[PDB]
Amino acid sequence: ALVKEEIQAKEYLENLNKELAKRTNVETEAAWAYGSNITDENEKKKNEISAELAKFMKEVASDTTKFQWRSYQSEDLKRQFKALTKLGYAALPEDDYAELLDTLSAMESNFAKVKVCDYKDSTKCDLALDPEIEEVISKSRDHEELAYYWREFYDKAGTAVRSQFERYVELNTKAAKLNNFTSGAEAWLDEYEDDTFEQQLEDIFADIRPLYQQIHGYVRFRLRKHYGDAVVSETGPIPMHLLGNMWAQQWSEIADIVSPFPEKPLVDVSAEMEKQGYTPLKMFQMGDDFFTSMNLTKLPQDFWDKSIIEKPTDGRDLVCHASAWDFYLTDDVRIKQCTRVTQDQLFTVHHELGHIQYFLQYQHQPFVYRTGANPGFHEAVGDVLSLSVSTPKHLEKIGLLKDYVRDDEARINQLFLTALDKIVFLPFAFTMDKYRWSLFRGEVDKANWNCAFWKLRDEYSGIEPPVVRSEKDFDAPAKYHISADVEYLRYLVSFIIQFQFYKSACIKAGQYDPDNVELPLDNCDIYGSAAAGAAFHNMLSMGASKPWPDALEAFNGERIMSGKAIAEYFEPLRVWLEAENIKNNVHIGWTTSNKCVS
Ligand SMILES: *[C@@H]1O[C@H](CO)[C@@H](O[C@@H]2O[C@H](CO)[C@@H](O[C@@H]3O[C@H](CO[C@H]4O[C@H](CO)[C@@H](O)[C@H](O)[C@@H]4O)[C@@H](O)[C@H](O[C@H]4O[C@H](CO[C@@H]5O[C@H](CO)[C@@H](O)[C@H](O)[C@@H]5O)[C@@H](O)[C@H](O)[C@@H]4O)[C@@H]3O)[C@H](O)[C@H]2NC(C)=O)[C@H](O)[C@H]1NC(C)=O
Ligand SMILES: CC[C@H](C)[C@H](NC(C)=O)C(=O)N[C@@H](Cc1ccc(O)cc1)C(=O)N[C@@H](Cc1ccc(O)cc1)P(=O)(O)O
Ligand SMILES: *[C@@H]1O[C@H](CO)[C@@H](O)[C@H](O)[C@H]1NC(C)=O
Ligand SMILES: *[C@@H]1O[C@H](CO)[C@@H](O)[C@H](O)[C@H]1NC(C)=O
Ligand SMILES: [Zn+2]
């Protein structure tokens, strides 16, 4: 009978979940040791534990076929069993999985070990991306210096791993097909449990795209005034090295030269943070304070004891891209961040702590449910907090923003500053996965892989390399997530839904009313709000126990991913910017780039 089997299956699941948590703990520990301390010994250790867990997963997926799980009454049991059938890379034969792991660590370690020579001193060749190269990219307004560092980094972080990337694509595809997905694109998209998900994102992107064009047009206009027309053309794609970010994914670092009202205040609290003697420790303690202030969970002692919150000062190689870690026990959660005392880093701290909070909220769930409702939810949590921390309202409370007058012009500056991070990012994030999807799906011949990347960057973002590239170069892996095999659509989803969360959290906190001029969405602070915290607790505690629309419904009663909230936030900027571009006869749109030779 199926009644007796379903009872037996429940007990099978309870034990197996706990076993998976314990085995994953061991893998995570080895991955932590390697990430904190890159060596051949730690690489070998990390990959061997992974190979071992993969083998166990194979046995698990095989064992699910012994249960008539599709016949069960309990939606919960069926959901758990379905999650267990999904093997990912662990579906690969033993030798193929080991090869994939070796390729993956070859790419991640290459990225982490990149060092370039000083622009002014060909003798000093120990400049790493974080912090040395990024310091220049964010601060230099010498266009040739910027171009030098761009070329050096992309040559070393990108082109150097072409053959490894090729083999990774092959094995990623082989794995996907062994799970009966068409390609790795479909395997990734499966995490969103919605067969129209791509179309939904296309529709939302199409609605916000006109606002992006206006911001792009205005930024290009302002850059021409700064650099002159020899460096920036009116009608062409923006040379990306001028945008204050190695990947041009966010442009806030150049706000001081492109701000709507240069004579009015522009929020940049980095200097005040340094003046008040801020430390990484203080920044994390402040993040903790924000969460607990909303009646959410305090960081456990293991976090403080075991986290790495500063770049180590010995000679060691490590991964400095900020990350948050769930060790799948109780309260063993960690962050590794090479924290610097800057405004952007203060947001990053809150982003990472958002992951940590999610871990703590769902750690009581069975193992397979100890993850985000979808990957976008996990990325959105910290950013909702970061949105309110970024407000003049909050920054004045914590003494970081002084003598600030919030008039109509200062408001436009702040909205524009936010847009330089939030709207600009949308086409960037979309192209990261449109590119990899196209390779996974076999839609681009290997002969055309590099210019296929830049074609997308041109088409969607209207940016281009500072120098002519060709198929001799291979630029995609110069972005961390591409070298490290981390799906990127999560961030596009995050940047849309975080505004749904923020709007609703602000309304619940009595911080936003569309008919009250004193409560604008763009100055909402949710600090200290137990009502906003309740909504978070209701949603995050669910983990992946239910399909994501149910998790969204738990937060604010809605079930649909929508661009309404983000457009609402930026509406006063849209009205002003459209008018300003008309007033200044600003050219909108761009010609096709000449910077990638076929
Ligand atoms: C991805 O898709 C793949 C298909 O493209 C799929 O691979 C298939 O998985 C099937 C398992 O579900 C498997 O089916 C079995 O086939 C056996 C014989 O196949 C041979 O000949 C084929 C050519 O004709 C070759 O291609 C194969 O390589 C094989 O050499 C059968 O002997 C076997 O049967 C037994 O099992 C079924 C079990 O089914 C259920 O059993 C319960 C009993 O508790 C029933 O109550 C229930 O109703 C249901 O029937 C029994 O019914 C039966 O009595 C036998 O005991 C079985 O049909 C198939 O061979 C395999 N390949 C192909 C090419 O079809 C992958 O599994 C998919 N991967 C993932 C991850 O989902
Ligand atoms: C081997 C441990 C992993 C590093 C970790 N996974 C776990 C279970 O701790 C993990 O994927 N952490 C996510 C944040 C995250 C965590 C879990 C999720 O379900 C979703 C996101 C994280 O740190 N994401 C960062 C990017 C990243 C993502 C994956 C990595 O392996 C390394 C870095 P972020 O978006 O903050 O820049
Ligand atoms: C890094 O790992 C090596 C082994 O490869 C070990 O000897 C060393 O102690 C580690 N360094 C640190 C700082 O933990
Ligand atoms: C704190 O959370 C609890 C439940 O976790 C809730 O009942 C309570 O309302 C919250 N605190 C306050 C002051 O509301
Ligand atoms: Zn993240």
PDB file of N, CA and C in Angstrom, residues 298-377:
ATOM      1  N   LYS A 298      20.037  38.238  15.801  1.00  0.00           N
ATOM      2  CA  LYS A 298      21.395  38.647  16.133  1.00  0.00           C
ATOM      3  C   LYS A 298      22.428  37.685  15.544  1.00  0.00           C
ATOM      4  N   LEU A 299      23.555  38.229  15.102  1.00  0.00           N
ATOM      5  CA  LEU A 299      24.658  37.395  14.649  1.00  0.00           C
ATOM      6  C   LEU A 299      25.191  36.549  15.808  1.00  0.00           C
ATOM      7  N   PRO A 300      25.312  35.228  15.594  1.00  0.00           N
ATOM      8  CA  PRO A 300      25.794  34.315  16.630  1.00  0.00           C
ATOM      9  C   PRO A 300      27.300  34.456  16.848  1.00  0.00           C
ATOM     10  N   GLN A 301      27.795  33.911  17.958  1.00  0.00           N
ATOM     11  CA  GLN A 301      29.205  34.028  18.322  1.00  0.00           C
ATOM     12  C   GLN A 301      30.150  33.389  17.302  1.00  0.00           C
ATOM     13  N   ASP A 302      29.722  32.276  16.705  1.00  0.00           N
ATOM     14  CA  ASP A 302      30.486  31.624  15.641  1.00  0.00           C
ATOM     15  C   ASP A 302      30.801  32.574  14.485  1.00  0.00           C
ATOM     16  N   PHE A 303      29.845  33.440  14.156  1.00  0.00           N
ATOM     17  CA  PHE A 303      30.048  34.430  13.102  1.00  0.00           C
ATOM     18  C   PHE A 303      31.253  35.314  13.420  1.00  0.00           C
ATOM     19  N   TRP A 304      31.262  35.903  14.616  1.00  0.00           N
ATOM     20  CA  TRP A 304      32.350  36.795  15.025  1.00  0.00           C
ATOM     21  C   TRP A 304      33.685  36.072  15.189  1.00  0.00           C
ATOM     22  N   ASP A 305      33.644  34.833  15.686  1.00  0.00           N
ATOM     23  CA  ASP A 305      34.857  34.043  15.919  1.00  0.00           C
ATOM     24  C   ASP A 305      35.524  33.574  14.636  1.00  0.00           C
ATOM     25  N   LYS A 306      34.714  33.254  13.629  1.00  0.00           N
ATOM     26  CA  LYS A 306      35.206  32.524  12.458  1.00  0.00           C
ATOM     27  C   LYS A 306      35.235  33.319  11.146  1.00  0.00           C
ATOM     28  N   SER A 307      34.533  34.449  11.098  1.00  0.00           N
ATOM     29  CA  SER A 307      34.494  35.269   9.883  1.00  0.00           C
ATOM     30  C   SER A 307      35.849  35.904   9.577  1.00  0.00           C
ATOM     31  N   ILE A 308      36.080  36.184   8.300  1.00  0.00           N
ATOM     32  CA  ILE A 308      37.228  36.967   7.871  1.00  0.00           C
ATOM     33  C   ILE A 308      36.660  38.266   7.313  1.00  0.00           C
ATOM     34  N   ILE A 309      36.909  39.364   8.022  1.00  0.00           N
ATOM     35  CA  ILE A 309      36.334  40.653   7.646  1.00  0.00           C
ATOM     36  C   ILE A 309      37.380  41.683   7.205  1.00  0.00           C
ATOM     37  N   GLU A 310      38.622  41.243   7.050  1.00  0.00           N
ATOM     38  CA  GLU A 310      39.684  42.085   6.513  1.00  0.00           C
ATOM     39  C   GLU A 310      40.577  41.227   5.647  1.00  0.00           C
ATOM     40  N   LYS A 311      41.134  41.815   4.590  1.00  0.00           N
ATOM     41  CA  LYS A 311      42.112  41.114   3.775  1.00  0.00           C
ATOM     42  C   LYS A 311      43.321  40.792   4.655  1.00  0.00           C
ATOM     43  N   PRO A 312      43.688  39.497   4.747  1.00  0.00           N
ATOM     44  CA  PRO A 312      44.861  39.072   5.514  1.00  0.00           C
ATOM     45  C   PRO A 312      46.140  39.757   5.032  1.00  0.00           C
ATOM     46  N   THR A 313      47.020  40.096   5.972  1.00  0.00           N
ATOM     47  CA  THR A 313      48.213  40.892   5.669  1.00  0.00           C
ATOM     48  C   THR A 313      49.499  40.086   5.466  1.00  0.00           C
ATOM     49  N   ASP A 314      49.405  38.758   5.515  1.00  0.00           N
ATOM     50  CA  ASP A 314      50.524  37.910   5.088  1.00  0.00           C
ATOM     51  C   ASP A 314      50.565  37.848   3.554  1.00  0.00           C
ATOM     52  N   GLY A 315      51.468  37.046   3.000  1.00  0.00           N
ATOM     53  CA  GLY A 315      51.623  36.990   1.545  1.00  0.00           C
ATOM     54  C   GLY A 315      50.629  36.116   0.792  1.00  0.00           C
ATOM     55  N   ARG A 316      49.653  35.551   1.505  1.00  0.00           N
ATOM     56  CA  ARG A 316      48.820  34.478   0.949  1.00  0.00           C
ATOM     57  C   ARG A 316      47.861  34.910  -0.161  1.00  0.00           C
ATOM     58  N   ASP A 317      47.565  33.968  -1.052  1.00  0.00           N
ATOM     59  CA  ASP A 317      46.520  34.136  -2.050  1.00  0.00           C
ATOM     60  C   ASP A 317      45.185  33.694  -1.466  1.00  0.00           C
ATOM     61  N   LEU A 318      44.127  34.426  -1.808  1.00  0.00           N
ATOM     62  CA  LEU A 318      42.766  34.106  -1.376  1.00  0.00           C
ATOM     63  C   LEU A 318      41.754  34.672  -2.363  1.00  0.00           C
ATOM     64  N   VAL A 319      40.499  34.249  -2.226  1.00  0.00           N
ATOM     65  CA  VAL A 319      39.400  34.838  -2.979  1.00  0.00           C
ATOM     66  C   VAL A 319      38.876  36.024  -2.174  1.00  0.00           C
ATOM     67  N   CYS A 320      38.997  37.229  -2.734  1.00  0.00           N
ATOM     68  CA  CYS A 320      38.540  38.440  -2.047  1.00  0.00           C
ATOM     69  C   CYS A 320      37.126  38.877  -2.420  1.00  0.00           C
ATOM     70  N   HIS A 321      36.529  38.283  -3.452  1.00  0.00           N
ATOM     71  CA  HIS A 321      35.134  38.612  -3.739  1.00  0.00           C
ATOM     72  C   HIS A 321      34.273  38.225  -2.540  1.00  0.00           C
ATOM     73  N   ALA A 322      33.564  39.211  -1.997  1.00  0.00           N
ATOM     74  CA  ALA A 322      32.763  39.050  -0.780  1.00  0.00           C
ATOM     75  C   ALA A 322      31.773  37.889  -0.877  1.00  0.00           C
ATOM     76  N   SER A 323      31.723  37.069   0.169  1.00  0.00           N
ATOM     77  CA  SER A 323      30.837  35.909   0.187  1.00  0.00           C
ATOM     78  C   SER A 323      30.313  35.601   1.583  1.00  0.00           C
ATOM     79  N   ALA A 324      29.144  34.961   1.624  1.00  0.00           N
ATOM     80  CA  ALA A 324      28.491  34.543   2.861  1.00  0.00           C
ATOM     81  C   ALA A 324      28.295  33.022   2.847  1.00  0.00           C
ATOM     82  N   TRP A 325      28.498  32.390   4.001  1.00  0.00           N
ATOM     83  CA  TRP A 325      28.636  30.940   4.086  1.00  0.00           C
ATOM     84  C   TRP A 325      27.719  30.329   5.142  1.00  0.00           C
ATOM     85  N   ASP A 326      26.972  29.310   4.725  1.00  0.00           N
ATOM     86  CA  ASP A 326      26.110  28.551   5.622  1.00  0.00           C
ATOM     87  C   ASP A 326      26.737  27.176   5.811  1.00  0.00           C
ATOM     88  N   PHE A 327      27.068  26.834   7.052  1.00  0.00           N
ATOM     89  CA  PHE A 327      27.742  25.560   7.315  1.00  0.00           C
ATOM     90  C   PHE A 327      26.790  24.428   7.691  1.00  0.00           C
ATOM     91  N   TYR A 328      25.496  24.734   7.672  1.00  0.00           N
ATOM     92  CA  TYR A 328      24.422  23.741   7.766  1.00  0.00           C
ATOM     93  C   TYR A 328      24.317  22.999   9.105  1.00  0.00           C
ATOM     94  N   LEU A 329      24.857  23.596  10.162  1.00  0.00           N
ATOM     95  CA  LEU A 329      24.649  23.079  11.510  1.00  0.00           C
ATOM     96  C   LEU A 329      23.630  23.981  12.207  1.00  0.00           C
ATOM     97  N   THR A 330      23.935  24.408  13.428  1.00  0.00           N
ATOM     98  CA  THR A 330      23.171  25.466  14.075  1.00  0.00           C
ATOM     99  C   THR A 330      24.133  26.625  14.354  1.00  0.00           C
ATOM    100  N   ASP A 331      23.793  27.800  13.822  1.00  0.00           N
ATOM    101  CA  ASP A 331      24.500  29.063  14.092  1.00  0.00           C
ATOM    102  C   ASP A 331      25.935  29.161  13.582  1.00  0.00           C
ATOM    103  N   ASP A 332      26.387  28.171  12.819  1.00  0.00           N
ATOM    104  CA  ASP A 332      27.698  28.285  12.197  1.00  0.00           C
ATOM    105  C   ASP A 332      27.528  28.918  10.820  1.00  0.00           C
ATOM    106  N   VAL A 333      27.621  30.245  10.802  1.00  0.00           N
ATOM    107  CA  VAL A 333      27.495  31.051   9.591  1.00  0.00           C
ATOM    108  C   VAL A 333      28.645  32.055   9.562  1.00  0.00           C
ATOM    109  N   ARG A 334      29.173  32.335   8.370  1.00  0.00           N
ATOM    110  CA  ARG A 334      30.379  33.156   8.226  1.00  0.00           C
ATOM    111  C   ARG A 334      30.333  34.066   7.006  1.00  0.00           C
ATOM    112  N   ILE A 335      31.099  35.151   7.075  1.00  0.00           N
ATOM    113  CA  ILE A 335      31.353  35.998   5.922  1.00  0.00           C
ATOM    114  C   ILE A 335      32.855  36.068   5.700  1.00  0.00           C
ATOM    115  N   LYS A 336      33.255  36.036   4.434  1.00  0.00           N
ATOM    116  CA  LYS A 336      34.609  36.390   4.047  1.00  0.00           C
ATOM    117  C   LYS A 336      34.515  37.625   3.163  1.00  0.00           C
ATOM    118  N   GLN A 337      35.039  38.743   3.662  1.00  0.00           N
ATOM    119  CA  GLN A 337      35.036  40.004   2.925  1.00  0.00           C
ATOM    120  C   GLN A 337      36.333  40.758   3.177  1.00  0.00           C
ATOM    121  N   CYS A 338      36.957  41.238   2.106  1.00  0.00           N
ATOM    122  CA  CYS A 338      38.115  42.115   2.221  1.00  0.00           C
ATOM    123  C   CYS A 338      37.612  43.544   2.380  1.00  0.00           C
ATOM    124  N   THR A 339      36.964  43.804   3.510  1.00  0.00           N
ATOM    125  CA  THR A 339      36.273  45.067   3.748  1.00  0.00           C
ATOM    126  C   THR A 339      37.169  46.304   3.759  1.00  0.00           C
ATOM    127  N   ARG A 340      36.690  47.356   3.102  1.00  0.00           N
ATOM    128  CA  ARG A 340      37.315  48.666   3.131  1.00  0.00           C
ATOM    129  C   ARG A 340      36.318  49.655   3.693  1.00  0.00           C
ATOM    130  N   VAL A 341      36.831  50.756   4.226  1.00  0.00           N
ATOM    131  CA  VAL A 341      35.989  51.763   4.848  1.00  0.00           C
ATOM    132  C   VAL A 341      35.490  52.752   3.787  1.00  0.00           C
ATOM    133  N   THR A 342      34.435  52.358   3.070  1.00  0.00           N
ATOM    134  CA  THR A 342      33.803  53.205   2.047  1.00  0.00           C
ATOM    135  C   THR A 342      32.287  53.074   2.120  1.00  0.00           C
ATOM    136  N   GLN A 343      31.578  54.009   1.491  1.00  0.00           N
ATOM    137  CA  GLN A 343      30.115  53.962   1.416  1.00  0.00           C
ATOM    138  C   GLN A 343      29.619  52.695   0.698  1.00  0.00           C
ATOM    139  N   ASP A 344      30.204  52.396  -0.461  1.00  0.00           N
ATOM    140  CA  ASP A 344      29.817  51.215  -1.233  1.00  0.00           C
ATOM    141  C   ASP A 344      30.042  49.931  -0.438  1.00  0.00           C
ATOM    142  N   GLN A 345      31.152  49.880   0.298  1.00  0.00           N
ATOM    143  CA  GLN A 345      31.460  48.737   1.153  1.00  0.00           C
ATOM    144  C   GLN A 345      30.486  48.581   2.320  1.00  0.00           C
ATOM    145  N   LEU A 346      29.954  49.698   2.814  1.00  0.00           N
ATOM    146  CA  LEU A 346      28.922  49.655   3.847  1.00  0.00           C
ATOM    147  C   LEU A 346      27.652  48.990   3.317  1.00  0.00           C
ATOM    148  N   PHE A 347      27.325  49.244   2.049  1.00  0.00           N
ATOM    149  CA  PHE A 347      26.193  48.566   1.411  1.00  0.00           C
ATOM    150  C   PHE A 347      26.500  47.089   1.207  1.00  0.00           C
ATOM    151  N   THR A 348      27.727  46.791   0.787  1.00  0.00           N
ATOM    152  CA  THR A 348      28.169  45.411   0.584  1.00  0.00           C
ATOM    153  C   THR A 348      28.084  44.584   1.877  1.00  0.00           C
ATOM    154  N   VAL A 349      28.528  45.164   2.993  1.00  0.00           N
ATOM    155  CA  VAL A 349      28.415  44.514   4.299  1.00  0.00           C
ATOM    156  C   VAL A 349      26.959  44.129   4.576  1.00  0.00           C
ATOM    157  N   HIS A 350      26.040  45.050   4.312  1.00  0.00           N
ATOM    158  CA  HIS A 350      24.614  44.789   4.501  1.00  0.00           C
ATOM    159  C   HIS A 350      24.076  43.745   3.519  1.00  0.00           C
ATOM    160  N   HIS A 351      24.617  43.735   2.298  1.00  0.00           N
ATOM    161  CA  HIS A 351      24.250  42.715   1.318  1.00  0.00           C
ATOM    162  C   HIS A 351      24.615  41.322   1.832  1.00  0.00           C
ATOM    163  N   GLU A 352      25.858  41.165   2.281  1.00  0.00           N
ATOM    164  CA  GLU A 352      26.343  39.877   2.778  1.00  0.00           C
ATOM    165  C   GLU A 352      25.598  39.437   4.033  1.00  0.00           C
ATOM    166  N   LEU A 353      25.304  40.390   4.919  1.00  0.00           N
ATOM    167  CA  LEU A 353      24.593  40.086   6.162  1.00  0.00           C
ATOM    168  C   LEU A 353      23.148  39.680   5.885  1.00  0.00           C
ATOM    169  N   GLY A 354      22.628  40.105   4.733  1.00  0.00           N
ATOM    170  CA  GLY A 354      21.307  39.685   4.264  1.00  0.00           C
ATOM    171  C   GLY A 354      21.274  38.195   3.957  1.00  0.00           C
ATOM    172  N   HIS A 355      22.355  37.684   3.364  1.00  0.00           N
ATOM    173  CA  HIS A 355      22.501  36.246   3.138  1.00  0.00           C
ATOM    174  C   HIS A 355      22.535  35.518   4.476  1.00  0.00           C
ATOM    175  N   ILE A 356      23.379  36.012   5.385  1.00  0.00           N
ATOM    176  CA  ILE A 356      23.523  35.438   6.726  1.00  0.00           C
ATOM    177  C   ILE A 356      22.178  35.373   7.459  1.00  0.00           C
ATOM    178  N   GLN A 357      21.416  36.459   7.410  1.00  0.00           N
ATOM    179  CA  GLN A 357      20.105  36.497   8.043  1.00  0.00           C
ATOM    180  C   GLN A 357      19.180  35.409   7.498  1.00  0.00           C
ATOM    181  N   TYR A 358      19.173  35.238   6.175  1.00  0.00           N
ATOM    182  CA  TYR A 358      18.375  34.195   5.527  1.00  0.00           C
ATOM    183  C   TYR A 358      18.780  32.811   6.055  1.00  0.00           C
ATOM    184  N   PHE A 359      20.087  32.555   6.183  1.00  0.00           N
ATOM    185  CA  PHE A 359      20.580  31.283   6.746  1.00  0.00           C
ATOM    186  C   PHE A 359      19.976  31.023   8.126  1.00  0.00           C
ATOM    187  N   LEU A 360      20.027  32.042   8.987  1.00  0.00           N
ATOM    188  CA  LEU A 360      19.573  31.921  10.372  1.00  0.00           C
ATOM    189  C   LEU A 360      18.060  31.732  10.447  1.00  0.00           C
ATOM    190  N   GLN A 361      17.342  32.389   9.536  1.00  0.00           N
ATOM    191  CA  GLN A 361      15.879  32.325   9.476  1.00  0.00           C
ATOM    192  C   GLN A 361      15.331  30.948   9.076  1.00  0.00           C
ATOM    193  N   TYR A 362      16.050  30.240   8.208  1.00  0.00           N
ATOM    194  CA  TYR A 362      15.577  28.934   7.739  1.00  0.00           C
ATOM    195  C   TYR A 362      16.369  27.711   8.217  1.00  0.00           C
ATOM    196  N   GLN A 363      17.280  27.889   9.175  1.00  0.00           N
ATOM    197  CA  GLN A 363      18.125  26.770   9.626  1.00  0.00           C
ATOM    198  C   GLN A 363      17.365  25.630  10.327  1.00  0.00           C
ATOM    199  N   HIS A 364      16.117  25.887  10.704  1.00  0.00           N
ATOM    200  CA  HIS A 364      15.260  24.876  11.320  1.00  0.00           C
ATOM    201  C   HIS A 364      14.584  23.991  10.271  1.00  0.00           C
ATOM    202  N   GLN A 365      14.529  24.472   9.026  1.00  0.00           N
ATOM    203  CA  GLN A 365      13.951  23.716   7.905  1.00  0.00           C
ATOM    204  C   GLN A 365      14.772  22.467   7.585  1.00  0.00           C
ATOM    205  N   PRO A 366      14.137  21.436   6.986  1.00  0.00           N
ATOM    206  CA  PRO A 366      14.917  20.320   6.444  1.00  0.00           C
ATOM    207  C   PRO A 366      15.937  20.811   5.419  1.00  0.00           C
ATOM    208  N   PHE A 367      17.074  20.125   5.335  1.00  0.00           N
ATOM    209  CA  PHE A 367      18.193  20.535   4.486  1.00  0.00           C
ATOM    210  C   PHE A 367      17.806  21.048   3.096  1.00  0.00           C
ATOM    211  N   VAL A 368      16.974  20.297   2.374  1.00  0.00           N
ATOM    212  CA  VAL A 368      16.631  20.671   0.990  1.00  0.00           C
ATOM    213  C   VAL A 368      15.857  21.990   0.900  1.00  0.00           C
ATOM    214  N   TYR A 369      15.263  22.413   2.016  1.00  0.00           N
ATOM    215  CA  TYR A 369      14.540  23.681   2.083  1.00  0.00           C
ATOM    216  C   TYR A 369      15.391  24.836   2.637  1.00  0.00           C
ATOM    217  N   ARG A 370      16.636  24.538   3.009  1.00  0.00           N
ATOM    218  CA  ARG A 370      17.547  25.540   3.571  1.00  0.00           C
ATOM    219  C   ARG A 370      18.292  26.289   2.467  1.00  0.00           C
ATOM    220  N   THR A 371      17.526  27.092   1.737  1.00  0.00           N
ATOM    221  CA  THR A 371      18.003  27.849   0.582  1.00  0.00           C
ATOM    222  C   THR A 371      16.935  28.889   0.264  1.00  0.00           C
ATOM    223  N   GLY A 372      17.224  29.813  -0.649  1.00  0.00           N
ATOM    224  CA  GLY A 372      16.270  30.869  -1.002  1.00  0.00           C
ATOM    225  C   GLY A 372      15.014  30.351  -1.680  1.00  0.00           C
ATOM    226  N   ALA A 373      13.920  31.102  -1.559  1.00  0.00           N
ATOM    227  CA  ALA A 373      12.672  30.766  -2.252  1.00  0.00           C
ATOM    228  C   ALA A 373      12.940  30.645  -3.757  1.00  0.00           C
ATOM    229  N   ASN A 374      13.697  31.603  -4.288  1.00  0.00           N
ATOM    230  CA  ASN A 374      14.451  31.422  -5.533  1.00  0.00           C
ATOM    231  C   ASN A 374      15.775  32.199  -5.405  1.00  0.00           C
ATOM    232  N   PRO A 375      16.745  31.979  -6.319  1.00  0.00           N
ATOM    233  CA  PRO A 375      18.042  32.630  -6.086  1.00  0.00           C
ATOM    234  C   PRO A 375      17.963  34.155  -5.957  1.00  0.00           C
ATOM    235  N   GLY A 376      16.984  34.775  -6.615  1.00  0.00           N
ATOM    236  CA  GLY A 376      16.759  36.219  -6.499  1.00  0.00           C
ATOM    237  C   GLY A 376      16.404  36.712  -5.102  1.00  0.00           C
ATOM    238  N   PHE A 377      15.602  35.936  -4.371  1.00  0.00           N
ATOM    239  CA  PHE A 377      15.220  36.285  -2.996  1.00  0.00           C
ATOM    240  C   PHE A 377      16.436  36.436  -2.090  1.00  0.00           C
TER     241      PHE A 377
END
